[PDB]
Structures are given as C-alpha cells and as structure tokens.
C-alpha cells in the first residue's frame, strides 16, 4: 500500500504539471475536486488510474 500511494502521488503530480492552472487557482481546484468526486461516484471508478480520473474530471469542466 505504501508504494501504491507514492506511485499514485507521482501520477497526480504529472497531471498537475500538465495542467498548472489547478495548483495556482483556488476556484479551479474547487471545480475540479467537485467533478473528481462525481467521476469517483461512477460505477467502475475503482478501475480508473488517478491520472484517468483527473483527466475525466478536467474534460467534464471543458464540457
């Protein structure tokens, strides 16, 4: 679990380097967290990587 955690953090870091607005802006981070929880409420969300979850949530804001 401890290694799984460090690797999930690394994946999250790369997504936030690809999308730097979110770590600069409280409002954007908030909107993203709202969509992120909504993705995670989807059936089968266990099967997503954190990268896939973050990208899905960001795409829901681009919609």
């Amino acid at each position: 679990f401890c290694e799984k955690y460090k690797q999930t953090k690394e994946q999250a870091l790369t997504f936030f380097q690809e999308h730097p607005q979110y770590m600069r802006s409280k409002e954007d981070e908030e909107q993203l967290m709202t969509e992120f929880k909504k993705v995670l409420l989807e059936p089968g969300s266990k099967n997503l990587s954190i990268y896939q979850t973050l990208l899905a949530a960001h795409e829901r804001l681009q919609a």
Partner: peptide, 11 residues
C-alpha cells in the same frame, strides 16, 4: 496533492 490521493484511495 494529499487531498487528491486520499479522495482517490477512498473511491
């Protein structure tokens, strides 16, 4: 980062 990881691991 930690808030994103802790939410993800609880899905």
């Amino acid at each position: 980062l930690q808030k994103w990881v802790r939410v993800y691991l609880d899905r």
